[PDB]
Design a protein around this ligand. Sequence first.
Ligand SMILES: [Mg+2]
Ligand SMILES: [Zn+2]
Ligand SMILES: [Zn+2]
Ligand SMILES: [Zn+2]
Lengths: 263, 43, 559, 196, 49, 158, 65, 159, 114, 133, 141, 84
Amino acid sequence: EEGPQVKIREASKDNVDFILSNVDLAMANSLRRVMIAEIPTLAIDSVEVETNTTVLADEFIAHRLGLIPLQSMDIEQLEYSRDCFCEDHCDKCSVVLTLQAFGESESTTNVYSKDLVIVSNLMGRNIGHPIIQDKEGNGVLICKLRKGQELKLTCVAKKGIAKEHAKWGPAAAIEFEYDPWNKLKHTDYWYEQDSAKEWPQSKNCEYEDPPNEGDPFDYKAQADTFYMNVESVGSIPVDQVVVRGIDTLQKKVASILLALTQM
Amino acid sequence: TLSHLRRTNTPIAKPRQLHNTHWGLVCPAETPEGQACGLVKNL
Amino acid sequence: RGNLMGKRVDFSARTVISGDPNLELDQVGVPKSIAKTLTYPEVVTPYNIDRLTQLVRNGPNEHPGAKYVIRDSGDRIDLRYSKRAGDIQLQYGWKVERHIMDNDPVLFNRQPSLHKMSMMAHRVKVIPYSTFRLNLSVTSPYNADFDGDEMNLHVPQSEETRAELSQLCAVPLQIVSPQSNKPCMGIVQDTLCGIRKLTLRDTFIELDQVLNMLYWVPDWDGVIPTPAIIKPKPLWSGKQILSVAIPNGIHLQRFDEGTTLLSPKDNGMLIIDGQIIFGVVEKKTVGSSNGGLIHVVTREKGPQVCAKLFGNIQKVVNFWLLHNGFSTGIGDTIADGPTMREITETIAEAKKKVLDVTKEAQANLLTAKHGMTLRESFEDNVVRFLNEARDKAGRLAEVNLKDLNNVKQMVMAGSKGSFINIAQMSACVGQQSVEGKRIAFGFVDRTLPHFSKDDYSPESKGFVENSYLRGLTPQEFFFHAMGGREGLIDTAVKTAETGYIQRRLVKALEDIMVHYDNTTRNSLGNVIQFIYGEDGMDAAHIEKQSLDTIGGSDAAFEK
Amino acid sequence: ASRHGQKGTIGITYRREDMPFTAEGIVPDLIINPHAIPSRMTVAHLIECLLSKVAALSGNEGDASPFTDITVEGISKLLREHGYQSRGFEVMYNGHTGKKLMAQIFFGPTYYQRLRHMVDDKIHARARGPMQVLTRQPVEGRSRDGGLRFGEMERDCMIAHGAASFLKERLMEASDAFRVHICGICGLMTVIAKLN
Amino acid sequence: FDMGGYFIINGSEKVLIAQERSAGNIVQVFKKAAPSPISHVAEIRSALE
Amino acid sequence: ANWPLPVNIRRIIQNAQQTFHIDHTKPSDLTIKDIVLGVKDLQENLLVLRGKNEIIQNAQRDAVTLFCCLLRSRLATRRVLQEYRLTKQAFDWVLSNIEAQFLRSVVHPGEMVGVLAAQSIGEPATQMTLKKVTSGVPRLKEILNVAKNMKTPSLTVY
Amino acid sequence: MIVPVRCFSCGKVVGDKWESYLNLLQEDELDEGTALSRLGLKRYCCRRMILTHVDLIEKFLRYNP
Amino acid sequence: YDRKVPSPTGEYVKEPEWVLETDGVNLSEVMTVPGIDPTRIYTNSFIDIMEVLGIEAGRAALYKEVYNVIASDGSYVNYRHMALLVDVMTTQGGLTSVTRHGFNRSNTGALMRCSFEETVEILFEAGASAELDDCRGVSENVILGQMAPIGTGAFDVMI
Amino acid sequence: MNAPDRFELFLLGEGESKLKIDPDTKAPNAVVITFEKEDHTLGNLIRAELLNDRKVLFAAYKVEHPFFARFKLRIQTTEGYDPKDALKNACNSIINKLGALKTNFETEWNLQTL
Amino acid sequence: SNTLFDDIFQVSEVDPGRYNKVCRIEAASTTQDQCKLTLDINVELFPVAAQDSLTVTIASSLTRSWRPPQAGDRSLADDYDYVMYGTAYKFEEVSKDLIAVYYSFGGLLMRLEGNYRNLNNLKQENAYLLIRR
Amino acid sequence: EGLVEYIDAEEEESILIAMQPEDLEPAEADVDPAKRIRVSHHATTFTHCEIHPSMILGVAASIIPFPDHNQSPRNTYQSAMGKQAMGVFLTNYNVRMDTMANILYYPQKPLGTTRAMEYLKFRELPAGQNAIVAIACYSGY
Amino acid sequence: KAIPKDQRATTPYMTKYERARILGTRALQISMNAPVFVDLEGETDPLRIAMKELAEKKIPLVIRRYLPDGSFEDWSVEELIVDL
RNA sequence: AUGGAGAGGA
Ligand SMILES: [Mg+2]
Ligand SMILES: [Zn+2]
Ligand SMILES: [Zn+2]
Ligand SMILES: [Zn+2]
């Protein structure tokens, strides 16, 4: 196709390692910012506690639930609770869930995210399932209970952005590097003897040419080819963090354009 | 709590100086500033 | 002395302070909740009403608002209760305690107050978050840092009290200060470590950036200056742009120790008309210095032109610096393989030079210097034998620190750091002293039970041969511990004695003002000086100026 | 404050994007100015960090014990064995732009503690309120919605500037004013003010 | 982990701080100032243990 | 030679051979009279002390004496025309300016100087902290105590 | 005081990995540096998240009511 | 010592001398010695100077001293402050101290000297002598809570 | 305690519009567009794209104080080009690049396994 | 609106006085033995080797906000590789019949020595410097 | 069994203590330049060698990592501060009742430890988080 | 005592204090809606009026200065020159 | 509200 040129080179359920060819740094970057903290997700945003005779205190669990990853795939057909025409939450905008556990055993009863339970009408949307990469099948580790210890919750999860708190962060760790052997001289390397024996090569170096000493500095060259990898918390599959990343940057770019027409 | 149980008070000719002898009996580092600096110590 | 000379007072406040790069020099970042509490009585006036009745309407807990409205009878409508607070018709004359607002004049303060400058006036920019914020530069006259300091703020309550604040006490009016007939506020840390950075000849800046920086200077005339380089690419030099922050008619001339209208070392500093011509910018220029840029721009342009100078030099340098960046790692405290070997020998000789003096003196061959003991001239010797070794090893390290070394860079910039700060870090820490003399014989005739008695050798008496980078040994440590403490002890006692000096010093002169016969007297009319300072002049407007009648040849004078 | 006199208060908070980033995607929880480093020669700090990076990577604990043979060099040789520049340096990229930082940055794990004294335990503001009984002067301490003492020493300051009306005002309408009655003769307050 | 060495009085934990004093029953000689009639002084703080 | 003195002359000069854009290959238009005689009766209105009587006026000649050694040394005829080729209007300014720039510097009656002179000495004493002389805070303590009982008394013979 | 859900700095989910961490040390008996690497915690901020955490909760359960 | 002094030829050139330095002070007898320049001899005791060479020359050393404590420390304070402080000490005739014995003795209003050290007794005997108060002092109008004759209140304003 | 809600970072308040456009009094043909509730994410990328546009004299942005999400983009264009149009195309271009970045990635994502 | 000086030069020194991007150039004039040059040359843009010969000009010609190109469709007094714009600050008598000028192209300075550039090299704010080949 | 003895200052005065048992008394006879420079074995008499130098330190000081790479006064500050460093002060905070008690939500055993934290129970009850510190000038906030 | 319109040493320059206190005293009067003696050129701040009132020397106040002997000198905000 | 002690911040 016409412009920017993605070459996927390593792909998993949670890592996309890709060259991005022919872009401004300004764009290669502003995509990343968006992938970090501008694509919506769903995570717990109101906890009502019925009973809590646990070691942990009320707002401490309340807070831990936030960070619990929820399948936000169809998140785009879920509304923002502040937008929606209800009062507090509803089944258009919120996914209620329940945590129930009570110690029975003599040997520490646990509470896992796998213990959570959808309670709102999903209405068919592929939403708010605690996401579990856990190999034995039980995600996170909410809290621990003694013999006689009870906890009874009702978390209403909402639509949000990592701008509005990094719990709604859909991305985790975004690797990002350009021009492997400072060909642009965008850094001055702190050295002690030999800049190049002291500072190490990043695997990215193979995919670009050496610098060939005898060549004089390339002044007019600019920023191309940006070597990235988006990891995914897993509330959105890898591809969709990038695709939605592209989309929502595209979206909020578009609403400037709209914004003019109103004026 | 630990530190505050192991404390020394000294009321009232140059007794603020960490004197040589404190070696390994009184802590060379731990002490408050100003007010009663080097008058209060820790074991 | 506690309920009359210094009373507790209304309309005050205090909070932790933090600094703020995009705040104006004469501004005081006042958190919204304090802004909500402190009032200024305003009289209802034909001019204001519309902005005032609005301020009532808003009520006492949404910012630009008010509590209490005062009437004819002098009653006191409380606006947090009262059946008529979302009402009220504002008659002329009435007073309307309002929230303190943007661009009010407040007295800002740090204790201990030991200045005119420890109490300034500021303009209240109101902000979120619970701290008072201030411009880094307004640091020195207040003596603040942000290790946790609290600061006071007092609010006038008459129209005249405001006058007196913004006409006498205002920060820009204090910029050039009578103390050392120099100015007291400068350019600190980042700005100063970055302005050196930006400015060295090797710093070139290409278009995209040079457009943003230019935008960043609020007083930009909106005219891109022609680039130094037009060739293969267009670039603008460091100096090039910053020069856009320097107003017009500002000529400055320095020269340093190698400097010749070409500044091969990029020495010195020439500024022809609002544009810099050569030399790196750094403290001596943009400091709190005597000849400095701040000293000039104040006298030459005004106070408020030079208030806004701090603003513009920072807004641009900050920005630059944000995007080049700056660090310090223990890499910066390593020094050459050979420079480490070369330093150790440089100690090891001061080691056999003490040995050899003690070896000499113990054999009664040491001559007692006039008016001092044998014991004394040997002490005086060995101390000046190990100081000359710290400095020699510290130098030998300072000379190895290449231009790219972040510590050596704040030393050149003059942002923080000294020589000795390097000498100790990378080389050897030097001798530890207490009571003025090297480490005592606390134990009987030895220093620590780990030495023999009568051991006057360097190590045994408190020389710290190692560097903070290599690490101190157990004794070295405990010796250092001893010095360290003697420090804290006086810095504790030093300051209590001082604040008493000040207290009499103040209480002695107190009533001395210049009278309308330009004479200098007290309350009784006992003259003290017949012309203030023997020349009639206020210290603010004085300046160092060479008198080129005094020096020079009898000949070259006639010539 | 870290762990070696190196204390400080938060000036601002930046979300993960606005923050500088190492190439592998990491971000700092905390940035501190390189200006608190040359003039308190807090050098342990710098080592700690470098050691704490290798520990977190290698997966063992760091032996920062005082009198040892642990060297910044041995620690370095170690971090090299492990893929990074052996002094704690790491090319970062400015958050806003994505443009490589021209200087490389010192960047590690560094044991850092959170002291008491948080702003909203201090933030105090007064504008009218309670008075002592004895003096009609305002009551002491922020816990009693008190007032700040216009100290003897700060009265010095208002005298310096020339501020006469403000000195009086911070000493009359703030604090206490009072309207006593005087006898044209003797010259005392022995007058019986039978006002009205 | 509570390590003790304190007392409990009216619910509050009070800790006794080691008070340092100058040791009894010991001989000390003190060179004594410029304007004194007594040049040296020998002194004993005498108490029954 | 480097001393504190009101009105920075050199920068009024720079701000003249800037303000009127002045070349260094073309003649002046000053009479040896304009220079010499203006210089002499600029002096006469650099007013610090005003009184029209004998004693006061003799105080005035003394309150300016030191500014004027400069004034004359930098507005001397060979220097004016040779070192900074002023013109008759540009000079008239450089003379006119110096007077206004001067009159600004005079201390204002009101200037509570006691409190000022204390703090100016007291503050940098506060920042004093640490070969055998009494120096620093302890010394300053003797001095102000009018210390009869001084720790380093000492002559210094010539 | 229980595992942090999700590392601070980097953002990744680490909570679900505490149990498996203990087991990779205690039972397979690998060194902590291997266990953390096997759990796929490759970044060193996501690493310290787990190695440094102290499961105090276990001491807290120990109290009665 | 070094000493910058004229060459005949004009230029200030470096002329080094020999200077001698003492522990202890008797001036009454060290200048009346043969051999020494008695126009230049200096004692760090400004309190000697004063009783020996006169009050006015006493002033100059009391200053030079104050100046040295400052400048040696690194600082610079403009002449006029140390001048005023020095002048203040010197102008009662003797060397009036900056303590409750010096400046606080001198006849100035009672309410004033009261707000320094000997707070109670100052008023006691000042209440015995039937002292009258000027009320021109800073301290006293502060105490009376009125507009103290200071900058803003030096003058007086009318129509 | 004085801290503002986080939703003030992308939600407009009462009366606030997404952009104000003003005449820059300094130069001619010069515009200073304020941008309530946005940041470097957007500002940076419009300024860098507003530059390849061969018909533009000046393009810069600046986050006044970072307590607030807002920024001033100033653009000066040629004799004839109106700056708004310079923005207009500057954005459309961005959207088209991204519209194509998306399809290209999508195409490549589909060929990979795992 | 026209040239102001012209000459070919021969470089006899390069100086990376601890700079990477700049060098100080000590060259002489082929022709007039009363002439030499001292100039800072951005060696990362246009490398200057020693033993080189370079052609130096002044002009003042081919001041409103610098425009970008679009002048990529405009004439430009450059048939040259390397070009700078600066200010003149001092004009020096080296006695004679000998005279020198000083230029700052924002910090990269210049020393130029001769005599015919009397009536030719104004006291001015203008001054370009064009180096080729 | 008499391998260890109790010494007070008065008696301390009459004995010679070794520092390192190891390096301070085998025979005598290369040296990694990086390791600090130590005096020597000098004087052979040693009645009784020291347990371990680090013991000269108190409860607050033995918390500081490499406190021997630090200009002294600094350790003293750190020493009065760690006493105001929020954390778990007892495992029984739920049950206990105090006018003021703060606990850190996620205490962490520091990454660099003194050998004496082991006995100080610090690793077990720490106050402080192992946060990622960038030393840089950023926005200058 | 007096001291006539002639024989005056007192500076015909306005002391910053004199001015700061006139600007205040006027800024007081003005804020209590006393009439204003210049055309408020879009200004409404009771003080920033009084500066415009003073730049145009239309303030009818007499600065009474005081010499130590008890004698005093009158000066109008007319005769008085505002340089600063 | 008053008196009195101790710890702590810059
Ligand atoms: Mg502080
Ligand atoms: Zn709903
Ligand atoms: Zn009566
Ligand atoms: Zn991580």
